[PDB]
Write a protein that binds this ligand. Structure first.
Ligand SMILES: CC(C)(COP(=O)(O)OP(=O)(O)OC[C@H]1O[C@@H](n2cnc3c(N)ncnc32)[C@H](O)[C@@H]1OP(=O)(O)O)[C@@H](O)C(=O)NCCC(=O)NCCSC(=S)C[C@@](C)(O)CC(=O)O
Lengths: 373, 376
């Protein structure tokens, strides 16, 4: 694949769609899903959520120029706001000159919380759980034999205590679960429910909440980009001066939450539309993102911007990125499936890596514009 | 208006649309926007964002039972995830028995930031700006005649310093701008750019960033709800015990960020789908919400839950809520306009007040389910 899409910006929607179909070797019938309204039929929509009266469209777009670990990728995006897609495509074009985006990710590990109340010895009860951790892990894994055969499963447990709250002592167990190609919510919740009776027997306490955490800080995806000063030169400003301006803008985000909120919103402009296009839960991605940004005790920037030993601008994005290829609405929505086909992703972590590349690109675009006006 | 919508959950989509069309007196043309797929014309879609190749549908639903300061309201929602609309609807049903949701909001005030670097005396420059604030405020208000004539504009300035960063001393001025019925980005960005030269002249620094803040903590919207124990009784648990379980779930969120993230995500399950239904920017609402949740230096719960002196469960939500009745897709998408019609909102702050009511109801529904689920 060549993702450069020359003159895409100026083609009609129909022409653009035909080119995409040609590049990818889409069938006529796949192209029909975008060439005509109504790919989400009403019997599917009506079964997805409650009280349905119709469907609501947003535009479906494709960003150009992306390249991830040396492979060109086409990126579908669904959103209402202008300039997002153009900026992403432009920053991807710049990145390609220097190797594109380089990405990595952790295993798809999600937390399942099990909250325990009713005991006067939470700190002791924590150790009772840990002593019996293999038993707990085995009980969790008995509940999803398929996931274990797919290469996932409950890997570990961690236990945290809150001995002094206004509502009395609490203990919180986390199952740590590899959820393979799912976002993970229903997969881990089921394990949390399975182990609850055993945790009650061990601790002597009462289990209350059994629920994933959206702070998915064991499910991290990472992206890098590099930009040279020559690329950032304008009529008004040297590239070197733009790079210094971007570093100043970054330091401003790092110290001031009023700026960090906006800086990180720019990142989510790039990410959330890919999450929507793939039928994934964008509230989950947002909650993970912004809670992670404040993990230090200060709400700061998700990205970093620095100058390397050659004077080049180097950016990173590392963040939680819980997404699926299966589960929820990813399989339900025919255009979610088409998006995954467009992307060519074969694992959920591959999708997560593309997401962070797009977020990094969108922040780059915002940094560049704001440093050059 | 009566928003109870009896039997709604079991009616066909077409019958549901008929029933709300009767209640509202929707025109033929309004109803027909949902007779067939494709209500967003491709020429409008193509003008909205770049590189458009088609459209992407999500389900469009209406939550029932909502009442805001005594008035029934119907709430359109666009989202992919189950249980949200039902939970919001059921908690709204319970709320009605005790007066519905009570709401308030601040004026639609947004921050514009102007970042100034390279000043050798930033703390002194800040006073030079504050002395000249009327001048700055008048410059800000020079160009947007329409906003001024509608009762908005720049109201004030504040100035903050960060004298020691790794990139040297920074001054940051904020324009405080009433943006009336807009979210406000273009309004405040434009003002930030306009005032920049003058600030530079006063301070002697280089202006760098000129840009809104999404941490819209002067644009707050507030909701309250009340639920009695009799309303919460289940087969297994008294309503009193359910209240205690909900308070336990709240305290857990207040102390543990791993729970708070999830808890707040449930609020946003309620809010974001209304933002989407009205053509508004949900990334801006998300950023304001979650940044606000950590203003203290601890990432906590946006909602509060207590028991009052009568033993009733009382909940609050106060948060930033920047939304528009105008701008972008809110104007150009025919269903964003239909949603506004369904809602009956006449100002952006009224839309914000409904948003927080729905977020509050969603969080209550989520907690209630988790607090009452038996052990397996
Ligand atoms: C890219 C923009 C929108 C237009 O740039 P321009 O200099 O006109 O680009 P140019 O015309 O040179 O085209 C260069 C490349 O840019 C792409 N491109 C430009 N315009 C379009 C378009 N209309 N459609 C598609 N592609 C476009 C395209 O890839 C093209 O390559 P090609 O010539 O090979 O096709 C430029 O205004 C810009 O970079 N904006 C970045 C900031 C921006 O508004 N971002 C949008 C979201 S807003 C955001 S993230 C919120 C913030 C800013 O508050 C976040 C924060 O505060 O941090």
């Amino acid at each position: 694949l060549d993702s450069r899409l020359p003159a895409f910006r100026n083609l009609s929607p129909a022409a653009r769609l035909d080119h995409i179909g040609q590049l990818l070797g889409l069938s006529h019938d796949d192209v029909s899903l975008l060439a005509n309204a109504g790919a989400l039929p009403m019997d599917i929509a009506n079964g997805m959520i409650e009280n349905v009266i119709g469907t609501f469209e947003l535009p479906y777009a494709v960003a150009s120029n992306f390249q991830i670990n040396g492979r060109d990728v086409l990126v579908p995006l669904v959103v209402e706001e202008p300039s997002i897609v153009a900026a992403a495509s432009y920053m991807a074009k710049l990145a390609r000159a220097n190797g594109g985006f380089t990405t990595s990710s952790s295993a798809p590990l999600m937390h399942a919380q099990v909250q325990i109340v009713g005991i006067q010895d939470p700190l002791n009860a924590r150790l009772s759980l840990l002593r019996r951790k293999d038993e707990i892990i085995e009980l969790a894994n008995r509940k999803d034999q398929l996931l274990n055969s797919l290469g996932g499963g409950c890997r570990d447990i961690e236990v945290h205590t809150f001995a002094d709250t206004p509502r009395g002592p609490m203990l919180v167990a986390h199952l740590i679960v590899d959820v393979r190609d799912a976002m993970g919510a229903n997969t881990v919740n089921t394990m949390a429910e399975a182990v609850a009776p055993l945790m009650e027997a061990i601790t002597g306490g009462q289990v209350r909440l059994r629920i994933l955490s959206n702070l998915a800080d064991l499910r991290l995806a990472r992206a890098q980009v590099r930009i040279t000063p020559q690329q950032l030169e304008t009529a008004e400003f040297s590239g070197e001066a733009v790079i210094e301006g971007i570093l100043d803008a970054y330091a401003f985000a790092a110290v001031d939450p009023y700026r960090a909120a906006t800086h990180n919103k720019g990142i989510m402009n790039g990410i959330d539309p890919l999450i929507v296009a793939t039928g994934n839960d964008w509230r989950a991605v947002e909650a993970g993102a912004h809670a992670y940004a404040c993990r230090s005790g200060h709400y700061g920037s998700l990205t970093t911007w620095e100058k390397d030993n050659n004077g080049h601008l180097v950016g990173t994005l590392e963040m939680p990125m819980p997404v699926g290829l299966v589960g929820g609405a990813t399989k339900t929505h025919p255009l979610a499936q088409l998006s995954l086909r467009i992307l060519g992703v074969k694992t959920a972590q591959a999708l997560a890596e593309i997401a962070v590349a797009v977020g990094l690109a969108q922040n780059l675009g915002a940094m560049r514009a704001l440093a050059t006006e």
